[PDB]
Amino acid sequence: MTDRYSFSLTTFSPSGKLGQIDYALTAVKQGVTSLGIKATNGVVIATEKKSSSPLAMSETLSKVSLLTPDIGAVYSGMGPDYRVLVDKSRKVAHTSYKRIYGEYPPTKLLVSEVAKIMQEATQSGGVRPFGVSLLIAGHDEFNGFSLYQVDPSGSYFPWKATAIGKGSVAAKTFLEKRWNDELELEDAIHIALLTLKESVEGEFNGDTIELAIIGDENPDLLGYTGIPTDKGPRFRKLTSQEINDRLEAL
Amino acid sequence: FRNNYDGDTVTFSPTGRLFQVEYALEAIKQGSVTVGLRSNTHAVLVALKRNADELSSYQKKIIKCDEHMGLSLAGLAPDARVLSNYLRQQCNYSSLVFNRKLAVERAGHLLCDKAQKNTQSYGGRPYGVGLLIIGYDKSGAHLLEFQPSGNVTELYGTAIGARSQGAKTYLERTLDTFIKIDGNPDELIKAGVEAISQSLRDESLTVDNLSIAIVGKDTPFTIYDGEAVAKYI
Amino acid sequence: GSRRYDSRTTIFSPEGRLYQVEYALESISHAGTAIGIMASDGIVLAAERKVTSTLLEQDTSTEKLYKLNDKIAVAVAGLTADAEILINTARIHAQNYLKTYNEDIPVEILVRRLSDIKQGYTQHGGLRPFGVSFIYAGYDDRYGYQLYTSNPSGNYTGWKAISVGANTSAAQTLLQMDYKDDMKVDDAIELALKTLSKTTDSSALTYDRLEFATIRKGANDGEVYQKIFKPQEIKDILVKTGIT
Amino acid sequence: TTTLAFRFQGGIIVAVDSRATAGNWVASQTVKKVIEINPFLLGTMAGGAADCQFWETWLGSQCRLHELREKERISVAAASKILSNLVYQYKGAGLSMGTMICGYTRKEGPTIYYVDSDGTRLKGDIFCVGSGQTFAYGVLDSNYKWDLSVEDALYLGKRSILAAAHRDAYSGGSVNLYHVTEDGWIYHGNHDVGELFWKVKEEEGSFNNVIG
Amino acid sequence: GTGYDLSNSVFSPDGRNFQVEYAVKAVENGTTSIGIKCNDGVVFAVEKLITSKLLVPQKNVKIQVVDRHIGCVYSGLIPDGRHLVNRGREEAASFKKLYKTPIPIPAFADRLGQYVQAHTLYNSVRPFGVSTIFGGVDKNGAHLYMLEPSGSYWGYKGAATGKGRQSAKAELEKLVDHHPEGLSAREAVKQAAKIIYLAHEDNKEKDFELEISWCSLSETNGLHKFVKGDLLQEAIDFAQKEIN
Amino acid sequence: DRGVSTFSPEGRLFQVEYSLEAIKLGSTAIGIATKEGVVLGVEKRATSPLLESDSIEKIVEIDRHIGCAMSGLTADARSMIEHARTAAVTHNLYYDEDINVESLTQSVCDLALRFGEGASGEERLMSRPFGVALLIAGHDADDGYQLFHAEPSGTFYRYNAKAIGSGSEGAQAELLNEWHSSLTLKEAELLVLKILKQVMEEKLDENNAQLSCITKQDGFKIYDNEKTAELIKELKEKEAAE
Amino acid sequence: GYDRALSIFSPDGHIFQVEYALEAVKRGTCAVGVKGKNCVVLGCERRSTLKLQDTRITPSKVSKIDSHVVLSFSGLNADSRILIEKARVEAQSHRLTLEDPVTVEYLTRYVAGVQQRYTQSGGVRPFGVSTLIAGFDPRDDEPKLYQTEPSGIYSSWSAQTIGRNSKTVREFLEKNYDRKEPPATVEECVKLTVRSLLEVVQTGAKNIEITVVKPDSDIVALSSEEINQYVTQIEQEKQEQ
Amino acid sequence: MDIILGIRVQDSVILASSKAVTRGISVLKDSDDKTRQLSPHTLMSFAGEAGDTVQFAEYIQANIQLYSIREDYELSPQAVSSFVRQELAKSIRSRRPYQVNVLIGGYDKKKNKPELYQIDYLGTKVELPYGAHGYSGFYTFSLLDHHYRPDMTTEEGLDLLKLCVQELEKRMPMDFKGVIVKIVDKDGIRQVDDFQAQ
Numbered sequence A: 001m002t003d004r005y006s007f008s009l010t011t012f013s014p015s016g017k018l019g020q021i022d023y024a025l026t027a028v029k030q031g032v033t034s035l036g037i038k039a040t041n042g043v044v045i046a047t048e049k050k051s052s053s054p055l056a057m058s059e060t061l062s063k064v065s066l067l068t069p070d071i072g073a074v075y076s077g078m079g080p081d082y083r084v085l086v087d088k089s090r091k092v093a094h095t096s097y098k099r100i101y102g103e104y105p106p107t108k109l110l111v112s113e114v115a116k117i118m119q120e121a122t123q124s125g126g127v128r129p130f131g132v133s134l135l136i137a138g139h140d141e142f143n144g145f146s147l148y149q150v151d152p153s154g155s156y157f158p159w160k161a162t163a164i165g166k167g168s169v170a171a172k173t174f175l176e177k178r179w180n181d182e183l184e185l186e187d188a189i190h191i192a193l194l195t196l197k198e199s200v201e202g203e204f205n206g207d208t209i210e211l212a213i214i215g216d217e218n219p220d221l222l223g224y225t226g227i228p229t230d231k232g233p234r235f236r237k238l239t240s241q242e243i244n245d246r247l248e249a250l
Numbered sequence B: 001f002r003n004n005y006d007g008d009t010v011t012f013s014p015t016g017r018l019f020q021v022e023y024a025l026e027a028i029k030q031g032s033v034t035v036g037l038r039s040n041t042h043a044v045l046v047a048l049k050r051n052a053d054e055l056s057s058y059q060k061k062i063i064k065c066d067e068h069m070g071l072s073l074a075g076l077a078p079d080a081r082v083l084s085n086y087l088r089q090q091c092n093y094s095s096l097v098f099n100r101k102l103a104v105e106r107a108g109h110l111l112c113d114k115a116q117k118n119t120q121s122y123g124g125r126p127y128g129v130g131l132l133i134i135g136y137d138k139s140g141a142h143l144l145e146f147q148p149s150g151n152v153t154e155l156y157g158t159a160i161g162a163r164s165q166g167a168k169t170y171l172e173r174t175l176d177t178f179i180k181i182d183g184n185p186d187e188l189i190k191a192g193v194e195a196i197s198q199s200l201r202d203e204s205l206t207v208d209n210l211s212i213a214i215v216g217k218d219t220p221f222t223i224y225d226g227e228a229v230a231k232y233i
Numbered sequence C: 001g002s003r004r005y006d007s008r009t010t011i012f013s014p015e016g017r018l019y020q021v022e023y024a025l026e027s028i029s030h031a032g033t034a035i036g037i038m039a040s041d042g043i044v045l046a047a048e049r050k051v052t053s054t055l056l057e058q059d060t061s062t063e064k065l066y067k068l069n070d071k072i073a074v075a076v077a078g079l080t081a082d083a084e085i086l087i088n089t090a091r092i093h094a095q096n097y098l099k100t101y102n103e104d105i106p107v108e109i110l111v112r113r114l115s116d117i118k119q120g121y122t123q124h125g126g127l128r129p130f131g132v133s134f135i136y137a138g139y140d141d142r143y144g145y146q147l148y149t150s151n152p153s154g155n156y157t158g159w160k161a162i163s164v165g166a167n168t169s170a171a172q173t174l175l176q177m178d179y180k181d182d183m184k185v186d187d188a189i190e191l192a193l194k195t196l197s198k199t200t201d202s203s204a205l206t207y208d209r210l211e212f213a214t215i216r217k218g219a220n221d222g223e224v225y226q227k228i229f230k231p232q233e234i235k236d237i238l239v240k241t242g243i244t
Numbered sequence D: 001t002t003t004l005a006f007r008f009q010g011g012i013i014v015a016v017d018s019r020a021t022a023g024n025w026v027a028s029q030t031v032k033k034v035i036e037i038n039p040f041l042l043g044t045m046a047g048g049a050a051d052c053q054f055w056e057t058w059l060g061s062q063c064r065l066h067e068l069r070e071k072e073r074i075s076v077a078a079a080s081k082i083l084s085n086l087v088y089q090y091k092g093a094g095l096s097m098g099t100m101i102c103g104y105t106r107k108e109g110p111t112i113y114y115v116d117s118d119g120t121r122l123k124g125d126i127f128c129v130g131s132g133q134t135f136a137y138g139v140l141d142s143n144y145k146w147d148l149s150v151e152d153a154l155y156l157g158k159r160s161i162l163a164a165a166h167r168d169a170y171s172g173g174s175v176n177l178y179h180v181t182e183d184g185w186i187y188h189g190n191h192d193v194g195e196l197f198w199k200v201k202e203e204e205g206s207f208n209n210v211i212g
Numbered sequence E: 001g002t003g004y005d006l007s008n009s010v011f012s013p014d015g016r017n018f019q020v021e022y023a024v025k026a027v028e029n030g031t032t033s034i035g036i037k038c039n040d041g042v043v044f045a046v047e048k049l050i051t052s053k054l055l056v057p058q059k060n061v062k063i064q065v066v067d068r069h070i071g072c073v074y075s076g077l078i079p080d081g082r083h084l085v086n087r088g089r090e091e092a093a094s095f096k097k098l099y100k101t102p103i104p105i106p107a108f109a110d111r112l113g114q115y116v117q118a119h120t121l122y123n124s125v126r127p128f129g130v131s132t133i134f135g136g137v138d139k140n141g142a143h144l145y146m147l148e149p150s151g152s153y154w155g156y157k158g159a160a161t162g163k164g165r166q167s168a169k170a171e172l173e174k175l176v177d178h179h180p181e182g183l184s185a186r187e188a189v190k191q192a193a194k195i196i197y198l199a200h201e202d203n204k205e206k207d208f209e210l211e212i213s214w215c216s217l218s219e220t221n222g223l224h225k226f227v228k229g230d231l232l233q234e235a236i237d238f239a240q241k242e243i244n
Numbered sequence F: 001d002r003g004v005s006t007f008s009p010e011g012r013l014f015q016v017e018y019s020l021e022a023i024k025l026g027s028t029a030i031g032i033a034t035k036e037g038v039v040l041g042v043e044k045r046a047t048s049p050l051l052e053s054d055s056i057e058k059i060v061e062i063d064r065h066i067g068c069a070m071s072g073l074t075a076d077a078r079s080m081i082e083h084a085r086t087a088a089v090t091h092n093l094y095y096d097e098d099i100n101v102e103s104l105t106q107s108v109c110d111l112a113l114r115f116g117e118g119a120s121g122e123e124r125l126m127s128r129p130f131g132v133a134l135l136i137a138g139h140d141a142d143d144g145y146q147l148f149h150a151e152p153s154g155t156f157y158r159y160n161a162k163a164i165g166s167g168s169e170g171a172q173a174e175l176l177n178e179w180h181s182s183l184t185l186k187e188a189e190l191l192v193l194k195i196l197k198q199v200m201e202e203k204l205d206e207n208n209a210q211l212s213c214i215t216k217q218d219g220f221k222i223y224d225n226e227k228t229a230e231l232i233k234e235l236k237e238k239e240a241a242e
Numbered sequence G: 001g002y003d004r005a006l007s008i009f010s011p012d013g014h015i016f017q018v019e020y021a022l023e024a025v026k027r028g029t030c031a032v033g034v035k036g037k038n039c040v041v042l043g044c045e046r047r048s049t050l051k052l053q054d055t056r057i058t059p060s061k062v063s064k065i066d067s068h069v070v071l072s073f074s075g076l077n078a079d080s081r082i083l084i085e086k087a088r089v090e091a092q093s094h095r096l097t098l099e100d101p102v103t104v105e106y107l108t109r110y111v112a113g114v115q116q117r118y119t120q121s122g123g124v125r126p127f128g129v130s131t132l133i134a135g136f137d138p139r140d141d142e143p144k145l146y147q148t149e150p151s152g153i154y155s156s157w158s159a160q161t162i163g164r165n166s167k168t169v170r171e172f173l174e175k176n177y178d179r180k181e182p183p184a185t186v187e188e189c190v191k192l193t194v195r196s197l198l199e200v201v202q203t204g205a206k207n208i209e210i211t212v213v214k215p216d217s218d219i220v221a222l223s224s225e226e227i228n229q230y231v232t233q234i235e236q237e238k239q240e241q
Numbered sequence H: 001m002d003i004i005l006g007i008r009v010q011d012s013v014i015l016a017s018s019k020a021v022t023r024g025i026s027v028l029k030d031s032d033d034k035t036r037q038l039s040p041h042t043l044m045s046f047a048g049e050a051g052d053t054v055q056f057a058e059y060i061q062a063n064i065q066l067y068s069i070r071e072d073y074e075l076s077p078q079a080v081s082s083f084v085r086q087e088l089a090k091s092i093r094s095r096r097p098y099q100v101n102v103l104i105g106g107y108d109k110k111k112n113k114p115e116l117y118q119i120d121y122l123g124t125k126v127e128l129p130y131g132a133h134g135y136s137g138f139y140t141f142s143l144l145d146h147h148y149r150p151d152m153t154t155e156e157g158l159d160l161l162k163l164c165v166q167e168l169e170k171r172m173p174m175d176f177k178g179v180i181v182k183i184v185d186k187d188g189i190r191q192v193d194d195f196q197a198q
Helices: A019-030 A079-101 A107-120 A168-178 A185-199 A240-247 B019-029 B077-098 B104-117 B164-178 B185-199 C019-028 C080-101 C107-123 C168-178 C185-199 C231-240 D049-070 D076-089 D133-141 D150-167 D193-204 E018-028 E078-099 E105-118 E165-178 E185-198 E229-242 F014-024 F074-095 F101-112 F168-178 F185-199 F225-240 G016-027 G077-098 G104-117 G166-174 G186-201 G224-239 H052-071 H077-091 H134-147 H154-171
Strands: A034-039 A042-048 A065-068 A071-077 A132-140 A144-150 A156-158 A161-164 A209-214 A235-237 B034-038 B042-048 B062-066 B069-075 B129-137 B140-146 B152-154 B157-160 B210-216 B219-225 C034-039 C042-048 C065-067 C072-078 C132-140 C144-150 C156-158 C161-164 C210-216 C225-228 D003-008 D011-016 D020-022 D025-028 D034-038 D041-044 D098-105 D109-116 D121-123 D126-129 D174-181 D184-192 E033-037 E041-050 E064-066 E070-076 E130-138 E141-147 E153-155 E158-161 E207-216 F029-034 F037-043 F059-063 F066-072 F132-140 F144-150 F156-158 F161-164 F212-215 F219-222 G031-035 G040-045 G063-066 G069-075 G129-135 G144-148 G154-156 G159-162 G208-214 G218-221 H004-008 H012-018 H021-023 H026-029 H035-039 H042-048 H100-108 H113-119 H125-127 H130-133 H179-185 H188-191
Touching: A019 A071, A019 A132, A034 A071, A034 A132, A034 A144, A034 A168, A034 A185, A042 A071, A042 A132, A042 A144, A042 A185, A065 A079, A065 A132, A065 A235, A071 A079, A071 A209, A071 A235, A079 A107, A079 A132, A107 A132, A107 A144, A107 A156, A107 C080, A132 A161, A132 A209, A144 A161, A161 A168, A161 A185, A168 A185, A185 A209, A185 A240, B019 B069, B019 B129, B034 B069, B034 B129, B034 B140, B034 B164, B034 B185, B042 B069, B042 B129, B042 B140, B042 B185, B062 B077, B062 B210, B062 B219, B069 B077, B069 B210, B069 B219, B077 B104, B077 B129, B077 F101, B104 B129, B104 B140, B104 B152, B104 E078, B129 B157, B129 B210, B129 B219, B140 B157, B157 B164, B157 B185, B164 B185, B185 B210, C019 C072, C019 C132, C034 C072, C034 C132, C034 C144, C034 C168, C034 C185, C042 C072, C042 C132, C042 C144, C042 C185, C065 C080, C065 C210, C065 C225, C072 C080, C072 C210, C080 C107, C080 C132, C080 H077, C107 C132, C107 C144, C107 C156, C107 G077, C132 C161, C132 C210, C144 C161, C161 C168, C161 C185, C168 C185, C185 C210, C185 C231, C210 C231, D003 D041, D003 D098, D003 D109, D003 D133, D003 D150, D011 D041, D011 D098, D011 D109, D011 D150, D034 D049, D041 D049, D041 D076, D049 D076, D049 D098, D049 F059, D049 F074, D076 D098, D076 D109, D076 D121, D076 G077, D098 D126, D098 D174, D109 D126, D126 D133, D133 D150, D133 H026, D150 D174, D150 D193, D174 D193, D184 D193, E018 E070, E018 E130, E033 E070, E033 E130, E033 E141, E033 E165, E033 E185, E041 E070, E041 E130, E041 E141, E041 E185, E064 E078, E070 E078, E070 E158, E070 E207, E078 E105, E078 E130, E105 E130, E105 E141, E105 E153, E130 E158, E130 E207, E141 E158, E158 E165, E165 E185, E185 E207, E185 E229, E207 E229, F014 F066, F014 F132, F029 F066, F029 F132, F029 F144, F029 F168, F029 F185, F037 F059, F037 F066, F037 F132, F037 F144, F037 F185, F059 F074, F059 F132, F059 F219, F066 F074, F066 F212, F066 F219, F074 F101, F074 F132, F074 G104, F101 F132, F101 F144, F101 F156, F132 F161, F132 F212, F144 F161, F161 F168, F168 F185, F185 F212, F185 F225, G016 G069, G016 G129, G031 G069, G031 G129, G031 G144, G031 G166, G031 G186, G040 G069, G040 G129, G040 G186, G063 G077, G063 H052, G069 G077, G069 G104, G069 G208, G077 G104, G077 G129, G077 H052, G104 G129, G104 G144, G104 G154, G129 G159, G144 G159, G159 G166, G166 G186, G186 G208, G186 G224, G208 G224, H004 H042, H004 H100, H004 H113, H004 H134, H004 H154, H012 H042, H012 H100, H012 H113, H012 H154, H035 H052, H035 H100, H042 H052, H042 H077, H042 H179, H052 H077, H052 H100, H077 H100, H077 H113, H077 H125, H100 H130, H100 H179, H113 H130, H130 H134, H134 H154, H154 H179
Parallel strands: none
Antiparallel strands: A034 A042, A034 A161, A042 A209, A065 A071, A071 A132, A132 A144, A144 A156, A209 A235, B034 B042, B034 B157, B042 B210, B062 B069, B069 B129, B129 B140, B140 B152, B210 B219, C034 C042, C034 C161, C042 C210, C065 C072, C072 C132, C132 C144, C144 C156, C210 C225, D003 D011, D003 D126, D011 D174, D020 D025, D034 D041, D041 D098, D098 D109, D109 D121, D174 D184, E033 E041, E033 E158, E041 E207, E064 E070, E070 E130, E130 E141, E141 E153, F029 F037, F029 F161, F037 F212, F059 F066, F066 F132, F132 F144, F144 F156, F212 F219, G031 G040, G031 G159, G040 G208, G063 G069, G069 G129, G129 G144, G144 G154, G208 G218, H004 H012, H004 H130, H012 H179, H021 H026, H035 H042, H042 H100, H100 H113, H113 H125, H179 H188
């Protein structure tokens, strides 16, 4: 027994490439498309719920996840990997931040934490890189709204808007055309819904699409009242109904 | 074939063999011959000590494990030291904790089990030595044959080493005869020297070349070398 | 066993070379070029952002210039993520030194420590080396302005002007051609931009594709100041030097 | 116990008593409180019998290893520091020992080091260690001269321990003498206090109190 | 490609684990041994090839007891079998110590099962080279089991493994059909002796020694005991007779 | 690749055999035991005239009654000598007596097979066998003067005379004829000096060769250059004598 | 966790990793050391693959282990640091317990042991470094010069060189160094050192650094000029013929 | 306890330390130097528990010398003192703390100013014109509080100590067998062999 794999599974080839990271990226390329658009007063992340059987209940499978009450994530690539990454991301937000400073981490730092976790799976002994690319959207008092991308290598970058997965090249191009630094959140949600339509083959509605936003504080989603400073989470997942309503104005 | 499945002991060949173990067994055959036989009152070990040059000593092949137990080796000397030392402790433990002399049958079980571990785990290597254990316990004289495979067998007599087959057939023939040599050590020893010589070929057992050990009813396991074995050549 | 799948990242080639280090350097050679120039009154760090898009948020971005201390900064060439790991441990080492001696860490001590960490992944552990090369630009009261460079092997050296990343050979010749010991920060700022401008594999050298930083001792003060140029600031200094 | 060692012109004198006790019980009158670390190193013992004997015998083993390793005789300073550093590792555990490491090296010449279980290590010319140290000091201090004869120094040493054996209930038995010159130590006998006292009394006229 | 059979935990393209399959070969190459479940106990018996007249008869015992109510017999690499029993013995001691009640057969079966299955999970270990037949009487009846190198096992009416597993199984099946009411401990002991004599034909070249053991609620009080003397000879004859 | 503690089809341990090859490439070392003491001689074999030959230490002291000579990858011998010295000194601390020469040798050989990447038997942390053979010579009250050959195989033989290193097969043959149970210490010295001269590529002088002995009276002593020089002269003379 | 045997014997009896470690040294810049009658001098060459360095801060090739001992080397730079640090720590530890600074042979024996150990320990590769350690034992005036190599072997030399073209410069020293009359001066010792380096450095006033070590912790490195002066006087010895 | 005094004058720091080493009923030595030179311009005096005292001093000495050789530079007095404080601060919360009090006097070649640091075994550090450890402070702090001036010459400083030492020899219960005085300034550390009657 005992993990005797204490050496790297990712190494440099004569050309300077790190095969496993490249291959991980290839896995991401095969993944369903996902994207994110930053508005002046909010951010939107969305993706397609590619149900693997009409018997499966697509709700019981969220591709879009809340990390902190003001930070959400979505991905493209290997779903299982993403799941454990969200578990770890939610926990590191506490262990390495809330438990020290008593406040949730700002989007850049949590992204940095996630990125670290991924970088390690690129050098630690006996493991393979994570086969996913994440898009994290959030808001913090001193940095406002932000949108980041974290790749299997552990590298991350901030975006105004971008797409990853299957038709990322096409979607990125479509976004460059419609984006501007004056978009309101609803405008971005619309632009988002349009971009996603080009990537969806079949049914395109509030049950096949999963979309969430980082916007205003939802005091109605706090769970309690009596503390003025606590105004509610900025992260909200749109309901099937809320999506359809915006689709009729597509 | 074989070349792909003999890299380490943790690999089974397509036919169910463990080559690393088999190669270990091969170090035994290349080892000098030694013989074991017992009556109902004694057990004897006769071993042919091998020498490098004519300027070198004839490497000892018999090790005492306790007042009532001992063995002879054929193969990697160091490995026999390791195994005999282990057996010395097992014997020692039995006395100190239970004030009981270790049964020769139990000694075998302990040896088998220790060897087995080095054949199922990565990184290790099988022991490359054969052992012949004799002893007198609460159930009489005993003789055991230990193979690195982990297989230990109780016999009336036997031999391991190069050309060991000679002595072995001889004992399988002399069986009914020596098994009755009770109350007479000199006769069992002679019967052993006769069995061992059935495997000679190169030379003839000399004085600083022969080594004999005996244990039984009223005989604490003792080793005889040189002048002491002169009267048997 | 596992031995079958072990690359043995820490062995010598028959020529006495370290495979992984050599291949990591090969990786570094395709990274955006980073330049460091040391003048009499300061140091300049300029780097070219590898890959960019219209949608890339350049304001909130940083992939090449990182602040280690208040008196030391580095320019990165290679795996950004690998760099961040090393950058963080470097930042901690600077603080242990401060908490221990109540004095800011001398530049070389910090550089040597970081280089030793790299050297380690070279001699034991069976892990791949870090695909990173750093240009360190710092200042201390013992050697004043200093410029250093370290790579995957764990070796480090000091320079008056140097480059890491892609087209270093070209950049070094251009630098070794117009550098002068009595230069001035503003001169270096210009030399740096020109050099990058001639080695870039891109069409033009625009501001959105750059990161700039200077460590000067603002005369009107007496202390050392690090300045990581903002998009607008890079766009300006770009027009002025005549690259528009 | 009473032990002394002092540096003078002719080298070093080392004298010890030989009594061992467990309370008021005199366990031994014939114990060796001087271990010959080697042909040129002596160690005095005071405190717990076991602690001294064991650790100083161990010290000897360490010195021998130094010589096999460095192809050179260990220095009095280095040898004493081995013991001192060992004893310090055990600080607080209860080891009880007052020791003197005396030797002669070409590099240091006559040298004496005081080492105790508190971790104290001191270099000096005169030291008295043990329950009877003060008694020895009284005699030794008032008759010491750097210019004593190897004969006189030996006697003062012997006489100093005698004094201690007499007044200290926990010291006694016999006196063991040693003289240290670069050619090593020279054993100078075991003088039973039982006979040494009367001899010294008569020949010296001291101990005038006691009736003889 | 190929090579899927060189490392223990590797899945071949058709979803198999060749090393375990090769372990099986080692088992099939071994002596034949069986187990017969009777109406209130179980009987174990095995073939003991007599290599030479030198083997002290009746001494090199193979059947092993676990605790005081379990019997175990195996075919294949004997040393591996001992290893597996040593484990089972600990497994049982542990269970008794915490729950007081000696370990139920099913419970014991899984203990052996999980441990064996464990050796098919890593490439740093080799699978067991033995198929083991074991059983006993517990709180609710008698139970017979057989465990493969894969870690697979099931409850059996009768079971056999080794060289003559086919003759044995053939014979066992007859018994199952001709005795829907259940064989008796006394009967099973004989039936067992015969099945070994029959199944010995696939090795008729070498002479052998018979070994039987049983655990019957009425015949042994639910404790495992070895069949010796008269009862043994009586079964040896019942076989020697029906072999002609 | 293949395990460092793997067996060859012939029943040999690859690493130990290859180990022996390295030792054949080593400098010659010879030892002769006589009822008057054991002599140990070695070929310095400097690799350049600028190398100060007397800094070549291939003959070392284990204890006052035990000396040892090495041949092969000599750097591998440092930890062995250390272990041996400690073993000897430790034995003396525990028992207040000299350690037997055989016992000391058995102790050193116990390190031999302690190599591998995870051998199930204890904690043998050593990536490879030693690449050096040793000749341990000494004396003890029970078996007088003794000479042992300790190899990386863990086995150790006792010899009346033995040669290891580049000129071993040749030198051993020589020793076969020249050695007899009544040799004097002086005869052994000259004999060792003679055989070294035949196998050495260089003309043997008191600078590229070194002698030493171990006698019950004075223990292990390494002959200084002047002492050996004369023995060399005495040898040239007796040879030219016939 | 990682303990793979990287340095192992091959059929012909060689440890290829240790052998390849030497190839690393062959590639390193040259280094030499010649002992005078009252001093030891250490010369080392400076590469030129890239020139625009800051000599003030760039790590020098000759390092002080203690105030009376120096160590130069040829091979992997990163590796040398590890050895230098351990050497420096051991130097202090020795002063702390023996109450006397280390002897050059002792400090050498130590560095060699660290190197040897890395040739037969799992999970590590040998040091691709060879060293020259020189100085004066405490209270002694007889100069000391030793050399170590990846294998862990060490010994003393009257003069020695390691690194690229060390073959060439050794020849020079072998037919230019008389043990009968060693450079009786610090000056003529430094000269014999530069001469040997010029046999390979090919005109490099700024490509040759020298350090002089005298008894009682008297250590100093020469400046470009001082050295450049020796080069000058040497080139004339040639032309004046 | 032992006498450990220190006084920072105009261009130097003077350290006076008692010469006695007493164990129980006997004064074992009367020429003990309770000081260790950490670097050419930094001196440290110490007093406290029997073994911990020197062991600690030498340990710190070793580390500073190692730093000096690694960096070929001399850490400022302020830096060396900060290192010592942290060492003691770690020690206080360990299994068996070093029970040692120290005075660190050094001349800062970069600032060209003498500095005197007082640090107790708890890791309590403070920079002072003059300091003392143990019972001495009880009679020397008010003395110096009276006769001390920042511009005093090294000579006036030695007179000042002599005054302290006399007060200590009049009112202190113990015979500390005089003191050993050392001067730390721009030229290093030197000992005043003549204080037995200056």
